[PDB]
Amino acid sequence: GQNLARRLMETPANEMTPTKFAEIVEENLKSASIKTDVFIRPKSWIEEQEMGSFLSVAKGSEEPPVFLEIHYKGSPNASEPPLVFVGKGITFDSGGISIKAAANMDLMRADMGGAATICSAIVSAAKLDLPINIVGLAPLCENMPSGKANKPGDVVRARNGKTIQVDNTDAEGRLILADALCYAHTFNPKVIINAATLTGAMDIALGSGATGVFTNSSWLWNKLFEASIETGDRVWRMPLFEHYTRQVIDCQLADVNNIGKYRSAGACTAAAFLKEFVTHPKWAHLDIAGVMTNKDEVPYLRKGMAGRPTRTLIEFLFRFSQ
């Protein structure tokens, strides 16, 4: 389940595009159980769904966006409310007009590691044939510079009606996730868990030793943390304080700005941006950017994309189902 994620992540973005990613997950989910349904929703659906914040990011590229929707119907009663997972699926993050430096931007092929991790865990929950209902949601697009890309300063409307000032085009995960997280409330979830290779600031923080989890639910914090002891693929809590909301809420043109005025608490400000799009009481945001890669730190993983934390996620679902 983890090695699927490592392969989804490691594959060069010109092979692991939005369509390709959805198609490999789709087949991997159906081989795991026929109690599944896949929807590789096209641009026209995303447009109909008024996901303008996600669409704003995908427009700079000629590679088509896909909104992947996975269902594993594992409960005896089909009407049991699901556990929903959301994941960032940028198949390559060049930054766009707020363009990235050349050095090591090849690792950005793994900026769909949020969508890889959660989708691999649904595939493994279904393989384990866990007695729960789970929806998997992943916006998939590339973030490229062009004559039609997002420009710094642009205001785009999220599905929920809020306007976002896109001050920095390299804060696109935030945007893709604004729309996918409003959509998760549609399913009437028990839990909303999103994952994302969101900020380099999480890497400066904990970055490497544990994935950061921002949650409004200490119950949910506790669940993920206990699964983490078991798998050994550690999780560490980070603050979801109003102080950070503030730095993202003061905004010139709009309701929310997609980046804070300061460098300080870079992963807490980006977490504050997502909460603006979440009304649910059991929500965890796992920022996976410091655990995207292995060099030598985790002994049993060779060098390259680590697929972290897919097993802590599978363990969480197992225990949640029992």
Binding site: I90, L107, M108, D170, A171, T199, A201, G266, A270, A289
Partner: peptide, 4 residues
């Protein structure tokens, strides 16, 4: 991925 933004940087910091």
């Amino acid at each position: 991925x933004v940087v910091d």
